[PDB]
Short mmCIF file of all heavy atoms in Angstrom, two decimals:
data_model
loop_
_atom_site.label_atom_id
_atom_site.label_comp_id
_atom_site.label_asym_id
_atom_site.label_seq_id
_atom_site.Cartn_x
_atom_site.Cartn_y
_atom_site.Cartn_z
N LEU A 136 -35.31 3.33 5.18
CA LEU A 136 -33.96 3.28 5.44
C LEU A 136 -33.09 3.90 4.29
O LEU A 136 -33.20 3.40 3.09
CB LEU A 136 -33.60 1.77 5.70
CG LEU A 136 -32.07 1.61 6.07
CD1 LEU A 136 -31.84 2.19 7.47
CD2 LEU A 136 -31.81 0.09 6.06
N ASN A 137 -32.32 4.84 4.63
CA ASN A 137 -31.39 5.45 3.62
C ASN A 137 -29.96 4.95 3.72
O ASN A 137 -29.51 4.62 4.82
CB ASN A 137 -31.33 6.98 3.86
CG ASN A 137 -32.69 7.64 3.55
OD1 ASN A 137 -33.00 7.90 2.40
ND2 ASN A 137 -33.49 7.93 4.62
N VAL A 138 -29.37 4.86 2.57
CA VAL A 138 -27.91 4.49 2.51
C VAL A 138 -27.12 5.55 1.78
O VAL A 138 -27.53 6.00 0.77
CB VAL A 138 -27.69 3.11 1.76
CG1 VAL A 138 -26.23 2.68 1.81
CG2 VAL A 138 -28.55 1.93 2.31
N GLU A 139 -26.10 6.06 2.52
CA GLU A 139 -25.28 7.18 1.96
C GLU A 139 -23.79 6.77 2.13
O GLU A 139 -23.46 6.32 3.20
CB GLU A 139 -25.58 8.45 2.63
CG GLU A 139 -26.90 9.18 2.15
CD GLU A 139 -26.90 9.61 0.73
OE1 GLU A 139 -25.87 9.93 0.19
OE2 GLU A 139 -27.95 9.61 0.16
N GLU A 140 -23.00 6.90 1.08
CA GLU A 140 -21.65 6.71 1.21
C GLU A 140 -20.81 7.91 0.86
O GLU A 140 -21.13 8.67 -0.09
CB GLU A 140 -21.09 5.56 0.23
CG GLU A 140 -19.80 4.93 0.75
CD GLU A 140 -19.35 3.69 0.01
OE1 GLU A 140 -18.95 3.81 -1.15
OE2 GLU A 140 -19.38 2.61 0.64
N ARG A 141 -19.75 8.11 1.67
CA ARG A 141 -18.74 9.15 1.42
C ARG A 141 -17.42 8.58 1.53
O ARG A 141 -17.13 7.57 2.15
CB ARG A 141 -18.98 10.30 2.45
CG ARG A 141 -20.35 11.05 2.45
CD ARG A 141 -20.62 11.70 1.03
NE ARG A 141 -21.92 12.46 1.16
CZ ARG A 141 -23.04 11.88 0.87
NH1 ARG A 141 -23.19 10.62 0.67
NH2 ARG A 141 -24.17 12.70 1.02
N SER A 142 -16.35 9.27 1.00
CA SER A 142 -15.03 8.83 1.19
C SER A 142 -14.08 10.01 1.57
O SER A 142 -14.38 11.14 1.25
CB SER A 142 -14.45 8.17 -0.08
OG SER A 142 -14.53 9.07 -1.23
N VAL A 143 -13.02 9.74 2.22
CA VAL A 143 -12.05 10.71 2.71
C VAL A 143 -10.68 10.24 2.44
O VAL A 143 -10.35 9.09 2.49
CB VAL A 143 -12.22 11.04 4.15
CG1 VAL A 143 -11.69 12.44 4.47
CG2 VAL A 143 -13.63 10.96 4.63
N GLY A 144 -9.79 11.14 2.17
CA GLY A 144 -8.41 10.83 1.86
C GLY A 144 -7.65 11.94 1.16
O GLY A 144 -8.23 12.81 0.72
N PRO A 145 -6.35 11.78 1.05
CA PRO A 145 -5.60 10.67 1.69
C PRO A 145 -5.35 10.87 3.16
O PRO A 145 -5.11 11.96 3.67
CB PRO A 145 -4.25 10.67 0.95
CG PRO A 145 -4.07 12.05 0.38
CD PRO A 145 -5.50 12.68 0.26
N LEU A 146 -5.55 9.81 3.95
CA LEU A 146 -5.21 9.84 5.41
C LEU A 146 -3.81 9.50 5.52
O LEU A 146 -3.22 8.68 4.81
CB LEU A 146 -6.11 8.79 6.08
CG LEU A 146 -7.60 8.94 6.06
CD1 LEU A 146 -8.27 7.81 6.87
CD2 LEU A 146 -8.09 10.30 6.56
N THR A 147 -3.13 10.10 6.49
CA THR A 147 -1.68 9.92 6.67
C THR A 147 -1.25 9.55 8.10
O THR A 147 -0.16 9.16 8.34
CB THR A 147 -0.87 11.17 6.22
OG1 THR A 147 -1.40 12.26 6.93
CG2 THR A 147 -0.97 11.32 4.73
N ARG A 148 -2.21 9.78 9.07
CA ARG A 148 -1.81 9.69 10.51
C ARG A 148 -1.99 8.26 10.97
O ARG A 148 -2.52 7.40 10.24
CB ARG A 148 -2.65 10.60 11.45
CG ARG A 148 -2.78 12.04 10.97
CD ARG A 148 -1.54 12.79 11.23
NE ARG A 148 -0.36 12.18 10.66
CZ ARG A 148 0.81 12.84 10.40
NH1 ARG A 148 0.85 14.19 10.64
NH2 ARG A 148 1.80 12.25 9.84
N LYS A 149 -1.62 8.01 12.22
CA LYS A 149 -1.72 6.72 12.78
C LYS A 149 -3.13 6.29 12.90
O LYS A 149 -3.49 5.15 12.68
CB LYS A 149 -1.01 6.73 14.13
CG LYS A 149 -0.56 5.30 14.67
CD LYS A 149 0.24 5.52 15.90
CE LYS A 149 -0.05 4.33 16.86
NZ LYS A 149 0.67 4.65 18.10
N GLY A 150 -4.02 7.29 13.22
CA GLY A 150 -5.49 6.91 13.37
C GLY A 150 -6.37 8.09 13.03
O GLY A 150 -5.90 9.22 12.54
N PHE A 151 -7.67 7.87 13.34
CA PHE A 151 -8.64 8.82 12.89
C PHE A 151 -9.96 8.58 13.66
O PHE A 151 -10.22 7.44 14.14
CB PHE A 151 -8.89 8.85 11.38
CG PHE A 151 -9.60 7.60 10.90
CD1 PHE A 151 -10.92 7.54 10.84
CD2 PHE A 151 -8.87 6.59 10.38
CE1 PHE A 151 -11.56 6.43 10.34
CE2 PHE A 151 -9.53 5.44 9.83
CZ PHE A 151 -10.86 5.46 9.78
N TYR A 152 -10.77 9.67 13.67
CA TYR A 152 -12.06 9.56 14.31
C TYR A 152 -13.07 10.00 13.26
O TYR A 152 -12.76 10.81 12.38
CB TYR A 152 -12.24 10.50 15.45
CG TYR A 152 -11.38 10.21 16.69
CD1 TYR A 152 -10.14 10.78 16.79
CD2 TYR A 152 -11.79 9.42 17.65
CE1 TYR A 152 -9.33 10.53 17.90
CE2 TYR A 152 -11.06 9.11 18.77
CZ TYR A 152 -9.79 9.67 18.88
OH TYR A 152 -9.01 9.37 19.98
N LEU A 153 -14.30 9.46 13.36
CA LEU A 153 -15.44 9.96 12.60
C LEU A 153 -16.35 10.60 13.62
O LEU A 153 -16.36 10.15 14.84
CB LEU A 153 -16.11 8.86 11.98
CG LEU A 153 -15.97 8.69 10.49
CD1 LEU A 153 -14.53 8.88 10.02
CD2 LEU A 153 -16.62 7.43 10.05
N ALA A 154 -17.11 11.65 13.31
CA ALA A 154 -18.11 12.21 14.12
C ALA A 154 -19.36 12.68 13.45
O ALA A 154 -19.26 13.08 12.28
CB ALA A 154 -17.51 13.35 15.03
N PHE A 155 -20.46 12.69 14.15
CA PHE A 155 -21.76 13.08 13.62
C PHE A 155 -22.33 14.20 14.41
O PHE A 155 -22.58 14.11 15.63
CB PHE A 155 -22.68 11.86 13.61
CG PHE A 155 -22.06 10.66 13.02
CD1 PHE A 155 -21.26 9.83 13.77
CD2 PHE A 155 -22.30 10.32 11.69
CE1 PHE A 155 -20.64 8.74 13.19
CE2 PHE A 155 -21.76 9.20 11.17
CZ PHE A 155 -20.94 8.45 11.91
N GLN A 156 -22.62 15.32 13.69
CA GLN A 156 -23.30 16.41 14.31
C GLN A 156 -24.82 16.42 13.90
O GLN A 156 -25.15 16.44 12.71
CB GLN A 156 -22.64 17.73 13.81
CG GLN A 156 -23.14 18.94 14.48
CD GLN A 156 -22.88 20.20 13.72
OE1 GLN A 156 -22.72 20.12 12.54
NE2 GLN A 156 -22.72 21.32 14.41
N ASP A 157 -25.59 16.33 14.98
CA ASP A 157 -27.01 16.58 14.80
C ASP A 157 -27.26 18.14 15.05
O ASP A 157 -26.74 18.70 16.02
CB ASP A 157 -27.81 15.77 15.80
CG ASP A 157 -29.27 16.31 15.98
OD1 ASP A 157 -29.94 16.38 15.00
OD2 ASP A 157 -29.58 16.64 17.12
N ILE A 158 -27.97 18.78 14.14
CA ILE A 158 -28.36 20.19 14.15
C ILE A 158 -29.81 20.42 14.54
O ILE A 158 -30.30 21.52 14.47
CB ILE A 158 -27.91 20.96 12.88
CG1 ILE A 158 -28.47 20.20 11.69
CG2 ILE A 158 -26.45 21.19 12.79
CD1 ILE A 158 -28.54 21.10 10.38
N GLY A 159 -30.51 19.30 14.80
CA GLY A 159 -31.96 19.39 15.10
C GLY A 159 -32.91 18.63 14.26
O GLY A 159 -34.05 19.02 13.99
N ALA A 160 -32.42 17.43 13.81
CA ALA A 160 -33.21 16.49 13.07
C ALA A 160 -33.75 15.40 13.93
O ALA A 160 -33.31 15.21 15.11
CB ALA A 160 -32.49 16.03 11.84
N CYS A 161 -34.58 14.47 13.47
CA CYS A 161 -35.00 13.27 14.07
C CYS A 161 -34.39 12.16 13.23
O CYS A 161 -35.07 11.67 12.31
CB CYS A 161 -36.51 13.11 14.03
SG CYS A 161 -37.22 11.98 15.28
N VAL A 162 -33.18 11.85 13.61
CA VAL A 162 -32.37 10.82 12.90
C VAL A 162 -32.13 9.55 13.73
O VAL A 162 -31.81 9.68 14.88
CB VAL A 162 -30.95 11.32 12.60
CG1 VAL A 162 -30.32 10.50 11.43
CG2 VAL A 162 -30.91 12.70 12.27
N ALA A 163 -32.30 8.43 13.05
CA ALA A 163 -31.84 7.16 13.66
C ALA A 163 -30.65 6.64 12.78
O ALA A 163 -30.88 6.20 11.69
CB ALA A 163 -32.92 6.09 13.77
N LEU A 164 -29.50 6.74 13.38
CA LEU A 164 -28.31 6.15 12.67
C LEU A 164 -28.16 4.65 13.01
O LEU A 164 -27.83 4.29 14.13
CB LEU A 164 -27.14 6.91 13.13
CG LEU A 164 -25.84 6.66 12.31
CD1 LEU A 164 -25.98 6.95 10.83
CD2 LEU A 164 -24.71 7.40 12.94
N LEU A 165 -28.49 3.86 12.03
CA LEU A 165 -28.63 2.36 12.20
C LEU A 165 -27.37 1.59 11.93
O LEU A 165 -27.26 0.41 12.32
CB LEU A 165 -29.81 1.83 11.37
CG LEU A 165 -31.30 1.85 11.71
CD1 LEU A 165 -31.47 1.41 13.10
CD2 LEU A 165 -31.80 3.26 11.59
N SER A 166 -26.50 2.17 11.18
CA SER A 166 -25.33 1.39 10.60
C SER A 166 -24.21 2.43 10.21
O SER A 166 -24.56 3.39 9.59
CB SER A 166 -25.68 0.53 9.46
OG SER A 166 -24.62 -0.20 8.95
N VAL A 167 -22.96 2.04 10.54
CA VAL A 167 -21.85 2.84 10.25
C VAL A 167 -20.69 1.88 9.96
O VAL A 167 -20.07 1.24 10.84
CB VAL A 167 -21.36 3.75 11.38
CG1 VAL A 167 -20.11 4.50 10.90
CG2 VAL A 167 -22.50 4.65 11.80
N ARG A 168 -20.32 1.79 8.66
CA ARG A 168 -19.35 0.89 8.22
C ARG A 168 -18.24 1.69 7.50
O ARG A 168 -18.60 2.44 6.58
CB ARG A 168 -19.99 -0.09 7.24
CG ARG A 168 -19.18 -1.31 6.92
CD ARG A 168 -20.04 -2.33 6.26
NE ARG A 168 -19.27 -3.46 5.69
CZ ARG A 168 -18.74 -3.47 4.48
NH1 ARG A 168 -18.86 -2.39 3.71
NH2 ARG A 168 -18.03 -4.59 4.09
N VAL A 169 -17.05 1.42 7.95
CA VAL A 169 -15.89 2.22 7.35
C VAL A 169 -14.97 1.18 6.87
O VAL A 169 -14.52 0.27 7.62
CB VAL A 169 -15.24 3.03 8.45
CG1 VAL A 169 -14.03 3.86 7.86
CG2 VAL A 169 -16.14 3.95 9.14
N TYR A 170 -14.48 1.30 5.65
CA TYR A 170 -13.62 0.33 5.02
C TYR A 170 -12.75 0.97 4.01
O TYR A 170 -13.04 2.07 3.59
CB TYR A 170 -14.44 -0.80 4.38
CG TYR A 170 -15.31 -0.29 3.25
CD1 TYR A 170 -14.82 -0.47 1.94
CD2 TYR A 170 -16.52 0.31 3.41
CE1 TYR A 170 -15.64 -0.03 0.87
CE2 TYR A 170 -17.32 0.66 2.39
CZ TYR A 170 -16.85 0.61 1.07
OH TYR A 170 -17.48 0.91 0.03
N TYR A 171 -11.68 0.22 3.58
CA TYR A 171 -10.92 0.78 2.49
C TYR A 171 -10.71 -0.34 1.50
O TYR A 171 -10.95 -1.55 1.75
CB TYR A 171 -9.60 1.35 2.91
CG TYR A 171 -8.58 0.45 3.45
CD1 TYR A 171 -7.59 -0.08 2.62
CD2 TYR A 171 -8.60 0.09 4.76
CE1 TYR A 171 -6.65 -0.94 3.08
CE2 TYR A 171 -7.62 -0.74 5.27
CZ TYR A 171 -6.72 -1.30 4.42
OH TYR A 171 -5.72 -2.11 4.88
N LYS A 172 -10.20 -0.01 0.31
CA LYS A 172 -10.09 -0.99 -0.76
C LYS A 172 -8.63 -1.46 -0.86
O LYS A 172 -7.75 -0.70 -1.12
CB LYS A 172 -10.51 -0.44 -2.12
CG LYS A 172 -12.00 0.03 -2.08
CD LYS A 172 -12.64 0.04 -3.41
CE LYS A 172 -13.98 -0.72 -3.47
NZ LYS A 172 -15.04 0.13 -2.94
#
């Protein structure tokens, strides 16, 4: 199990989407947690 964190900002709009592009790997995405401080 791998854990990777990234951050994005500054966000300014009412909302947002996250998306994941598979390019041909064998990936199991087990957890996706988005938070701010």
